[PDB]
Design a protein around this ligand. Structure first.
Ligand SMILES: *Cc1c(COP(=O)(O)O)cnc(C)c1O
Ligand SMILES: *Cc1c(COP(=O)(O)O)cnc(C)c1O
Lengths: 335, 338
C-alpha cells in the first residue's frame, strides 16, 4: 500500500490561536489486532496534542479568555488567574501572551514537573500547592488571592465556566465531519468534563443514537458515586463532580486502574507508534473494552487523546516495561 | 478583530505517519514591532512541531524509511540503525513502529537522557556509547556494528541521504501553496541541510528571485568557511558541511550567536505566544534582520521553525530572565550593524 502525507493547509494564520482545533482523527491498528475485535469495528483516536501547546486544553484556555474579553469580563488592567492540573495553566499562558494579559497560576506539585516548567517562559507568574491537595491546593489558592485584590482579576474557573464546555462544540463538529456522520461511540477521560459534555451535547444535536462514555480513575470513581481517592492518571480524577458536568449527556462511565492506563499508554506507542499520555491510556483501554463487545461490531468508535506522553517523561509512565507478546499484553489489559 | 480556530481536516488517517507535513504558516507580530521593520513586509513562521513528534524530522525519518522500503534497501529481517541523539532518532522510531521495523539509535551515554526515554518508549534499542567520546563514539559503534553484521542494518545516514532532501519538496510545496506563490525569502537554520536545499530546489522551480538564506551558529560558521567551534544552538551547527548540501541553492548565509538565538526564542514565546526552540530562535532573528533591509520592504519572508521549546526545558533556554520592555529586547536583538 502507499502512504500519503498531509497536503498544504492553504491558509496563513494571523496568530498561533488560529492553529487551535481541527485535530487529526487516526485509526488504531497495532493495539486492535485482537481476535474479539472485528475488522469492521473501527477504533479511531482524536489527537489533541496537535494543538499549538500539545493539549486539548488549548481550546479551553483560548475560549475562556477570548470570550471573557469580548464579554467585558476581562479588560485592560485586569489579569487572568486560575488554578489548574497542568495544561489549562499552559493554554492560559498561550492565550495571555497573544492577547497581552499577565497570567497567574496555582497548581499541585505532584502532577508533572515539566508543566510547571512551561508557564514561566510564557510570561506567567506561579504558585504551587501540596499533593493530596487534589484541588484545595489548585482551586482555593486563587480564591483567597483574588479576595482582597478586588475587580483586578478574572478567574478562569475551568470547572464551572461554560466557555470550557462550549469550546468543545468544535471538537464535536470535527468528529462528526471527519467520520462523515458515522461516529457511533465517543470515549472521553474526564477532568473538568468540558470535553465529554461539550462533545455530547453537540453530537446529540446531530444524531441522538451516539453513545457517550466517560472514563475516570478506578481509585477515585467520583462520577460513579465514589469518593476522592489517590490515583496516578494525570489530568483527570479531580476528586469532585465539576459544575459543568451533566450526567444526562453521559451514557456509561468506565473506571480504569491507574496502572492499566499506563500499560495501555505503553502498548499504544509501541504497537501504533502513537505517543499518548496517561489519560489517553485510560480512554483507549476503555475504548478497546467497548470494541470487543458483541453489539459494537462494525461500529465507529472515537476516543479523545488529550495529550502527548513526552510531557510525562519525569513520571513512571515509561519506567516499568511489559512482559510477553502484544496479544499477550493485550489480553492482560482486556481481561 | 475576529479570531477563527481551524476547521475539521475532513479526513481519517490510516496511521499516524499520514499526519506528517502540511504544517501551519503563521504570521509573527509581537516581535516585528520595531522601528526598522516596515509595515508592509510579511514575516511568517512555518511551525514544524505540528508534526506527530513535534519536529521537522518526522518528514525525514518517514521518507528515509518509506523510500528504502520502496526501493528494497530496507526489507523484512533487517533493522534500522543511526547514531543520533536528536529528533531524527525519534523520527526513525516512529516510522519503525508503524512499518514494523526494529530501530537502533546510538548516542553518548551521558546526554539527553529522556529523549532517550522517548526513544525507548517507541521500543528502540538504545546503543549508549562512551560519554567523553561523543557523537564520534556513537558513529564508531554504528560502523563497528554494521561491519561485523554485514547486510543486517539499514543506515539512515541523515547527512548524506538524498531522501532527506527530497522530503522537503513537500515543505516547499506547502510554502508555495500557503503563500499563494507570494513567498519571496525562505530562512532555514541548517542541521543536515535537508530543509534549506530540498525547499530551495523545489521553490526555484516555481519562480525566479526567491531568496534562500541558510542560518548557522556564529561560533561554528562552517558553511561560511570558518572553523568548527563549540556553540549552544541544538539541532544545527553540525561542525562540518553535510554531503547533501549544495552551495548553489543558497544565496546568503547568516551567522547567529548562541545567546542571541536563545534570546529571540524567549521573545517569540513571550510576545507571540509561540514556544519555538533554539534553532527557531536563530532563524527568526536571521529572518527579522532580513526584514529590516531596505530592499525587502513589502516582501513575504518565510522562516522555518524546526521544533518546540518544550524539548529544551532541561537546557538554559528559559533559565535567563531578560530585563527591559519589549521594545528594549527587540531593539537589543536588532542593533548590530553593516
Ligand atoms: C486537562 C486534561 C484533560 C481534560 O479532560 P476534560 O474533560 O476536558 O477536563 C484530560 N487529560 C489530560 C492529560 C489533561 O491535561
Ligand atoms: C533536524 C533539526 C534541524 C534540521 O535542520 P536541517 O537543515 O533540516 O538538517 C534544525 N533544528 C532542529 C531543532 C532539528 O531537530
Amino acid at each position: 500500500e502507499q502512504i500519503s502525507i498531509s497536503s498544504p493547509r492553504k491558509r496563513i494564520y494571523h496568530n498561533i490561536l488560529e492553529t487551535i482545533g481541527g485535530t487529526p482523527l487516526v485509526e488504531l491498528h497495532g493495539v486492535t489486532e485482537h481476535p474479539r475485535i472485528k475488522k469492521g469495528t473501527r477504533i479511531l483516536v482524536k489527537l489533541e496534542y496537535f494543538n499549538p501547546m500539545s493539549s486539548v486544553k488549548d481550546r479551553v484556555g483560548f475560549n475562556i479568555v477570548y470570550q471573557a474579553i469580548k464579554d467585558g469580563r476581562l479588560k485592560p488592567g485586569m489579569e487572568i488567574i486560575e488554578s489548574t492540573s497542568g495544561n489549562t495553566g499552559i493554554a492560559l499562558c498561550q492565550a495571555g501572551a497573544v492577547f497581552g494579559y499577565r497570567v497567574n497560576i496555582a497548581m499541585p506539585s505532584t502532577m508533572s514537573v515539566e508543566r510547571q516548567m512551561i508557564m514561566k517562559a510564557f510570561g506567567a507568574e506561579l504558585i504551587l500547592t501540596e499533593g493530596k491537595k487534589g484541588m484545595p491546593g489548585a482551586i482555593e489558592e486563587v480564591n483567597k488571592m483574588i479576595k482582597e485584590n478586588p475587580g483586578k482579576y478574572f478567574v478562569a474557573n475551568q470547572f464551572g465556566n461554560p466557555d470550557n464546555t462550549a469550546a468543545h462544540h468544535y471538537t464535536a463538529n470535527e468528529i462528526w465531519e471527519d467520520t462523515d456522520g458515522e461516529v457511533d461511540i465517543v470515549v472521553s477521560a474526564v477532568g473538568t468534563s468540558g470535553t465529554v459534555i461539550g462533545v455530547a451535547e453537540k453530537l446529540k444535536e446531530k444524531k441522538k443514537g451516539i453513545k457517550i462514555i466517560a472514563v475516570e480513575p478506578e481509585e477515585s470513581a467520583v462520577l460513579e458515586g465514589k469518593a476522592k481517592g489517590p490515583h496516578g492518571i494525570q489530568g483527570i480524577g479531580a476528586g469532585f463532580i465539576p459544575d459543568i458536568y451533566k450526567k444526562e449527556f453521559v451514557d456509561e462511565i468506565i473506571p480504569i486502574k491507574t496502572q492499566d492506563a499506563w500499560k495501555m499508554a505503553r502498548a499504544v506507542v509501541k504497537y501504533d507508534g502513537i505517543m499518548c499520555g496517561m489519560s489517553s491510556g485510560a480512554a483507549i483501554l476503555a475504548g478497546l473494552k467497548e470494541a470487543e463487545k458483541p453489539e459494537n461490531e462494525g461500529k465507529t468508535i472515537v476516543i479523545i487523546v488529550p495529550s502527548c506522553g513526552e510531557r510525562y517523561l519525569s513520571t513512571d509512565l515509561y519506567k516499568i516495561k511489559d512482559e510477553g507478546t502484544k496479544i499477550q499484553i493485550l489480553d492482560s489489559l482486556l481481561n
